[PDB]
Design a binder for these strands. Structure first.
Ligand code: MG
Ligand code: ZN
Ligand code: ZN
Lengths: 80, 108, 545, 141, 63, 24, 287, 59, 117, 112
RNA sequence: AAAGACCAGGC
């Protein structure tokens, strides 16, 4: 989808990880494997790192319009 | 409550660990010691000839624990150099004690 | 959920993002967890070891101060590895909300790394901080994701780093630079602290001594693997410090260039790992040497003091009885006394301890040493001071009265003595008026920044970068700006993104230098705050001032 | 087996000076084979004057028989290495840029742990040196 | 209140030396000579006796 | 200006709600 | 089959009870520092650890009295042979018990109208081996006026100076490097003798002196040197560089040992050597 | 600002609480040279010691 | 001496603020008085120009004025030292006291004249 | 050994040089006079006043330190406590009168 | 309860 940034912002990253960890705390099945981890936030971080997370976002423009998007389509890949 | 001074827990007094990146190299972790043992063991290992690295470190200055790292050549091994340093330190202390007892008996 | 107030102390040997918490605090604050799969055994271990304080299944809060089924709330006590967020009480501390990782100790204070003093603008002379403890899981995600130290590493007021090498670290680097070589024992002792391996010696064999490393090989022991970058005064290649040019006037900027090289190409935490390996190495380097200062450092010679007094009684005192009788536009006084102060600083930087304990290029910190070693300078004047002119005339008549031993041998507003040799009673009274005026200006005068920040936040609160990129108000939905930066677009990400509250960042970046200027209350920092008020506080109605 | 040797004579000390307190930089031409050189050297363990005689070698290994090199110089049974020299360094070649400006001169850049050295000269000698190769600075009077 | 048993810095026993120091002061000695004759060599030990304030006598009257 | 005379003038002249998550 | 051993040499210059001065050479500074650190913080003594107070009518409170009682030195020659109270199974603490505990008692009451001193000569042990150290009148504890009373019972145990400074046997143990002084006599002739007096008057202590019987200078007692740079900065201030030079003569030290009297000054050094052997033995590798 | 409490933290606090003098003013924060040393204080009031809060120079 | 005997012989005088404007006073120092006699009075000591917590500070004219203000107005009221000599009849809210209070090694003129510890 | 160690970055910035002059004076008056003259009145000419506005000059304080056997600059050589080596820098030492204030750490701990 | 009044620590 055009006209917006192909990067994910920090405010989307925070809410995606928050809702994913809240889902995992509610007995949801984990889309990846566990290398001996217990914290749900780190499981959600591994899910975001492996891009195995099902969600969709809607970026609202100021004029009323929006842009639908699927969460495995943004660049989250940036080291230093 | 002032009892956790020299007694360790169910751990070993000394624990050996042979690192993977460099060969002929190890790090001995000693519980309930500080600068006193670590400094003389370090300066006795430097007197050895098949020792290329010897160094000691407290992980935190408020902990009663040291870590001693030895890297040797291929003519010896870290455990031999450690034990040779300790035996040499005992024989030096015995020589010192005999000299001091002789001088004290001489002075009267 | 919970909050906590405590006195802070420092600790240089734990990590930058770590905070030490007293046990009396830690065993009475709880964290809440929802028990479910992947944590039945791990939480069962905790409740068996009596580390969970309380419980609620459903809603009826039964205490434990019971086996676990999936679906209730366990309240356990704070342990190692949790996340809190820290704030000194934000009187001026507008952006100091930091997220830190918890370890527990037995003392009564809160321990932080000394690199975190300038991000918090705190010191260890009695300051207290508030720690806050996030309970909800989405709040934990927001705190961990927006306010961590590696996330917040590059500043949003300036373009610089929030972490700078300060007092003891920079002094350790300077003394590591004035002698270049190190023997084997101390080099291997330092190499115990590095994250990398110690290299082969730069000098293998001289006929005089044994092998010897240089300090560049010691400084390279904190780099990550396969680093290769470049800046102004350095070349790093193959995770080796190939080149580092001479200086003490450049050294902090070269270290800042090395860290920005690492944080432009190295990782997710590698600049923090660089600091966490560098700082204890520098402490352990300086510790078997010591650093002190004696009376010899503070005693200017008889010759240089005679030159200072001769330059005063030649140049400064006949002029000051002329151009002070004119009005305010003649600040030639300040330039001429600054020339004499330059002469005094050139004299006093011959002592080896004094040039390492200050910043030489700084001028507010170099006037303070001239006041100690040489003359104090001008103390009384009747231009833009908070006292009147009748006080100045009374002090000039009193100067005629008390120095009955050859009155008018100088001026009444110039103090010729130093702090190290002691003031006269008249010079003490003249200095005490100037000190009292600075103290009153710093305490009573903190209401115009307080008003300015309120009126700045009242208008700049709701200005956001929008999803299409235009900087817009949100209560009126009007365009304030078409682009925030000049190279921001949807191919190149930048320092600022959509959703950023740029109005609050502008208001705080405007309020910080105002508070700093009034809290200093120097003449330069008074004139700057005047020049700032003459722009920020214009009036739409004509006042014909 | 070495890769270079030449007797050098210093032209001057300190082309700028004002640097670290126990380092001297020597700028030198060569006597026998046409070469240009300027180097950082320690002053207290090896004082060096103007108008000297010294020769320089560029071996990549100390051992006269064996090829590998791991470890410091703790002498003993295998002291049979090149001990013909009083001052040795160990560093890295980091820039082997080819000039073609006064093409008889071709420059080369090495660094011994922060101590720099530039060596110009003919293209017929700086070829077996290659980029990112460890080198030594065997040097005697 | 009373003289401390040991010097604060080094740990030398000084607690049996107060009345001797007062007796030497009463026979017209200087403070330096009264400390020289009593065996105190380090200045840390000398500042324990030069600076002690003997509050036990005032506490004994006011009950 | 950033005072009352400027503030009442404009007042007289005149993240949250940025995105939404849902299942897919 | 290798050996890399040292051979230290000891020469005692003055030895008495509670004092020892001796020079030690041909070892490293790490070994001298180990002996110093162990003598300060590792050699055990016996000191009062529990105080149980029955009557206190004095104008001092109980923590003041207990802290004063904790710091009185007792005679401790048994301390290497008895055991810590964390290790003794033959008792419960709480009384007299050999290998771990000594009981003391004290009782005093003023009946005259003069002020009664209560010293450390009023503490009576139930063991005639562990008594307070004899130095005078004894160490003052409290003073009473009339009708006041002190009555208590104490338990003295074994410990080390790393735990509390009341168990340390050393009022001060220190060493110093032995100096090596050279004076270049070919540059000493260049100075007139008032300039020589001006040079010698820069030294704080009495290391150099002037013998006008040959009109020269001489280094006499080169161990009063304190390694400040005063004479060297004076000769560098006159321009006459390199006239004198001082280097610390390596592997040679001078130890000074003072004890509180709980143990003798030779026994402190010998127990330091024994404890340092005992912790070198417990660190070994089994293999 | 007439009657104060006597402090007994040490005897010096009680000593200096009994030797104070005050210029009471209407709105604290707009005074003239009341907060400053005048040369007629010489020998009779201390020109070095004073509070630093609102009562700076007035006490 | 007594103070009354020195007043009754005219060696000392009590002087107010307005009369002191007609006075040439030597600065305390007898070396200012006796090197030149164009004076009518002389001070007893210059350090008596300061208050009781400021005159006892060593080298107090060698420090910056904000620091002397910090010491003599704030920090000396908060120090823990002597409290009282009859604590059995003092029911204060808080009372603190050192175990062994000491006096300084130096001797100012005010501390030699008041004779208080 | 010291009782209190303070940082040398506190002195060039706070403008309190008198703290160095008090410590150099106090050290001169608690030390024994070594009697290089060997006369009776070795402790007669001892300077101990430091009265404000009539302080002693620094030549008197340094001459008092020199008669006691110390360097005039006020610093002295010290050995490192953890390793035993002679430290390269000389250290300023001396007695200062310190005060323990009523603000204590265990009274500032609060939790809501 | 609520306000006055005081003091202290910061800004
Ligand atoms: Mg502060
Ligand atoms: Zn002592
Ligand atoms: Zn028992």
């Amino acid at each position: 989808p055009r006209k917006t940034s192909k990067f994910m912002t920090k405010y989307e990253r925070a809410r995606i990880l928050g809702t994913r960890a809240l889902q995992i705390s509610m007995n949801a099945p984990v889309m990846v494997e566990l290398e001996g981890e217990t914290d749900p936030l780190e499981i959600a971080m591994k899910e975001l790192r492996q891009r195995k997370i099902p969600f969709t976002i809607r970026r609202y423009l100021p004029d009323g319009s929006f842009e639908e998007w699927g969460v495995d389509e943004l660049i989250v890949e940036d080291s230093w | 409550r002032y009892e956790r001074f020299v007694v360790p827990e169910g751990t070993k007094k000394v624990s050996y660990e042979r690192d993977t990146k460099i060969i002929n190299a190890a790090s001995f972790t000693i519980e309930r010691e500080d600068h006193t043992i670590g400094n003389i063991v370090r300066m006795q290992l430097h007197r050895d000839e098949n020792v290329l690295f010897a160094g000691y470190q407290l992980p935190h200055p408020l902990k009663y624990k040291i870590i001693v790292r030895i890297h040797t050549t291929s003519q010896s091994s870290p455990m031999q150099a450690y034990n040779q340093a300790i035996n040499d330190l005992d024989k030096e202390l015995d020589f010192l004690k005999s000299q001091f007892e002789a001088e004290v008996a001489k002075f009267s | 959920g919970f909050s906590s107030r405590s006195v802070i102390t420092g600790d240089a040997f734990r990590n930058v993002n770590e905070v030490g918490i007293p046990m009396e605090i830690a065993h009475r604050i709880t964290f809440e967890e929802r028990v479910s799969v992947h944590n039945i055994g791990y939480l069962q271990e905790l409740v068996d070891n009596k580390m969970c304080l309380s419980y609620t299944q459903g809603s009826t809060t039964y205490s434990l101060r019971t086996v676990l089924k999936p679906g209730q709330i366990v309240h356990r006590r704070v342990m190692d590895g949790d996340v809190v967020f820290i704030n000194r009480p934000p009187t001026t501390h507008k952006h100091s909300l930091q997220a830190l990782r918890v370890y527990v100790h037995e003392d009564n204070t809160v321990k932080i790394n000394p690199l975190m003093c300038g991000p918090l603008s705190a010191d260890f002379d009695g300051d207290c901080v508030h720690l806050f403890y996030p309970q909800s899981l989405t709040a934990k995600a927001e705190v961990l994701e927006l306010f961590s130290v590696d996330k917040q590493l590059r500043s949003s007021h300036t373009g610089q780093l929030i972490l700078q090498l300060g007092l003891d670290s920079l002094l350790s680097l300077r003394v590591m630079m004035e002698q270049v070589f190190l023997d084997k024992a101390s080099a291997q002792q330092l190499a115990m602290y590095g994250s990398r391996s110690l290299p082969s010696p730069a000098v293998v064999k001289s006929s005089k001594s044994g092998p010897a490393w240089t300090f560049f090989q010691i400084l390279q022991l904190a780099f990550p693997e396969r680093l290769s970058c470049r800046g102004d005064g350095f070349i790093v290649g193959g995770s080796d410090l190939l080149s580092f040019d001479f200086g003490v006037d450049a050294l902090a900027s070269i270290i800042n260039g090395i860290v920005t090289g690492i944080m432009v190409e190295k990782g997710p935490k590698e600049a923090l790992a660089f600091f966490d390996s560098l700082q204890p190495l520098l402490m352990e380097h300086l510790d078997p040497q010591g650093f002190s200062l004696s009376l010899e450092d503070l005693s200017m010679s008889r010759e240089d003091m005679g030159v200072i007094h001769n330059l005063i009684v030649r140049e400064i005192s006949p002029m000051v009885s002329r151009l002070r009788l004119s009005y305010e536009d003649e600040l030639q006084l300040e330039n001429s006394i600054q020339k004499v102060k330059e002469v005094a600083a050139n004299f006093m930087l011959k002592s080896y301890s004094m040039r390492n304990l200050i910043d030489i290029k700084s001028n507010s910190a170099i006037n303070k040493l001239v006041q100690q070693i040489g003359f104090l300078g001008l103390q009384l004047s009747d231009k833009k001071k908070l006292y009147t002119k009748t006080l100045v005339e009374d002090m000039a008549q009193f100067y005629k009265k008390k120095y009955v031993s050859t009155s008018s041998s100088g001026d009444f507003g110039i103090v010729k003595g130093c702090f190290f040799h002691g003031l006269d009673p008249y010079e003490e009274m003249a200095h005490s008026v100037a000190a009292r005026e600075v103290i009153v200006r710093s305490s009573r005068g903190l209401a115009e920044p307080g008003t300015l920040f309120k009126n700045l936040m009242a208008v700049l609160r709701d200005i956001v970068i929008t999803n299409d990129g235009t900087v817009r108000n949100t209560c009126s939905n009007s365009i304030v700006q078409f682009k925030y930066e000049l190279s921001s677009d949807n191919e190149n990400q930048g320092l600022f993104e959509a959703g950023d509250p740029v109005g609050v960042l502008a208001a705080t970046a405007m309020s910080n230098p105002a508070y700093k200027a009034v809290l200093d209350s120097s003449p330069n920092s008074n004139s700057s705050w005047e020049l700032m008020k003459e722009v920020l506080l214009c009036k739409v109605n004509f006042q014909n001032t | 087996i070495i890769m270079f040797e030449d007797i050098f004579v210093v032209d001057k000390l300190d082309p700028d000076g004002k640097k670290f307190d126990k380092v001297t930089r020597i700028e030198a031409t060569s006597h026998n084979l046409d070469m240009f050189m300027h180097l950082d050297v320690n002053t207290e363990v090896y004082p060096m004057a103007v108008g000297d005689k010294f020769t320089l070698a560029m071996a990549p290994t100390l051992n006269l028989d064996g090829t590998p090199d791991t470890g410091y110089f703790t002498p003993g049974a295998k002291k049979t290495l090149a001990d013909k020299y009083e001052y040795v360094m160990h560093g890295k070649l980091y820039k082997i840029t080819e000039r073609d400006g006064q093409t008889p001169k071709a420059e080369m850049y090495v660094s011994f742990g922060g101590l720099l050295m530039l060596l110009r000269g003919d293209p017929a000698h700086i070829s077996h040196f290659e980029l990112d190769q460890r080198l030594f600075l065997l040097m005697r009077k | 209140m009373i003289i401390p048993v040991r010097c604060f810095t080094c740990g030398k026993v000084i607690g049996n030396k107060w009345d001797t120091y007062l007796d030497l002061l009463q026979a017209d000695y200087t403070e330096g000579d009264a400390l020289d004759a009593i065996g105190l060599v380090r200045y840390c030990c000398r500042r324990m006796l030069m600076t002690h304030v003997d509050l036990i006598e005032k506490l004994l009257n006011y009950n | 200006g950033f005072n009352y005379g400027g503030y009442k003038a404009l007042t007289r002249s005149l993240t949250g709600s940025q995105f939404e998550l849902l299942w897919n | 089959g290798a050996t890399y051993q040292r051979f230290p040499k000891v020469k005692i210059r003055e030895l008495k009870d509670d004092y020892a001065k001796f020079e030690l050479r041909d070892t490293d500074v790490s070994m001298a520092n180990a002996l110093r650190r162990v003598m300060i913080s590792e050699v055990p003594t016996v000191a009062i650890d529990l105080v149980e107070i029955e009557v206190n009518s004095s104008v001092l409170n109980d923590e003041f009295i207990a802290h004063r009682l904790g710091l009185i030195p007792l005679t401790s020659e048994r301390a290497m042979s008895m055991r810590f109270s964390r290790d003794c199974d033959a008792c419960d603490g709480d009384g007299q018990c050999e290998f771990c505990s000594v009981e003391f008692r004290l009782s005093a009451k003023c009946v005259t109208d003069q002020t009664l001193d209560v010293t450390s000569k009023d503490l009576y042990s139930a063991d005639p081996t562990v008594t307070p150290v004899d130095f005078q009148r004894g160490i003052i504890i409290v003073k009473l006026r009339r009708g006041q009373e002190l009555k208590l019972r104490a338990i003295a145990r074994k410990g080390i100076g790393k735990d509390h400074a009341k168990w340390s046997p050393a009022a001060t143990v220190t060493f110093m490097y032995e100096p090596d002084i050279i004076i270049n006599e070919d540059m000493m002739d260049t100075l007139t003798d008032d300039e020589k007096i001006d040079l010698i008057e820069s030294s704080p202590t009495k290391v150099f002196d002037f013998d006008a019987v040959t009109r020269q200078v001489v280094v006499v007692d080169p161990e009063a040197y304190t390694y400040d740079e005063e004479v060297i900065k004076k000769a560098e201030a006159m321009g006459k560089q390199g006239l004198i030079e001082i280097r610390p003569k390596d592997d040679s030290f001078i130890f000074t040992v003072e004890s509180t009297g709980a143990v003798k000054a030779s026994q402190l050094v010998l127990n330091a050597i024994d404890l340092l052997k005992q912790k070198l033995d417990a660190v070994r590798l089994s293999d | 600002g007439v009657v104060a409490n006597l402090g007994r933290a040490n005897p010096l606090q009680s000593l200096i609480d009994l030797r104070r003098t005050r210029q009471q003013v209407l709105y604290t924060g707009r005074v003239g040279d009341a907060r400053y040393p005048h040369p007629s204080h010489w020998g009779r009031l201390c020109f070095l010691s004073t509070p630093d809060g609102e009562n700076c120079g007035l006490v | 001496y007594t103070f009354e005997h020195l007043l009754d012989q005219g060696i000392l005088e009590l002087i107010g603020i307005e009369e002191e404007e007609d006075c040439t006073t030597a600065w305390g120092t007898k070396q200012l008085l006796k090197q030149q006699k164009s004076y009518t009075h002389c001070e007893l000591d210059l350090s008596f120009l300061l208050g009781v917590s400021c005159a006892i500070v060593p080298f107090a004219n060698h420090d910056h004025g904000r620091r002397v203000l910090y010491q003599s107005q704030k920090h000396c009221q908060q120090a823990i030292g002597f409290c009282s000599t009859n604590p059995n009849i003092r029911c204060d809210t808080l009372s603190q006291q050192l175990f062994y209070p000491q006096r300084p090694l130096f001797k100012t003129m005010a501390s030699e004249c008041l004779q208080k510890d | 050994v010291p009782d209190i160690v303070i940082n040398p970055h506190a002195f060039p910035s706070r403008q309190t040089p008198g703290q160095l002059l008090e410590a150099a004076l106090s050290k001169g008056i608690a030390c024994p006079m070594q009697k290089k003259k060997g006369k009776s009145d070795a402790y007669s000419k001892v300077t101990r006043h430091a009265t404000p506005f009539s302080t002693p000059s620094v030549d008197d304080i340094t001459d008092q330190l020199h008669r006691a056997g110390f360097s005039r600059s006020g610093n002295e050589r010290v050995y490192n406590g953890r390793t035993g080596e002679m430290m390269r820098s000389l250290i300023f030492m001396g007695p200062n009168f310190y005060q323990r204030l009523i603000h204590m750490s265990e009274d500032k701990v609060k939790f809501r």
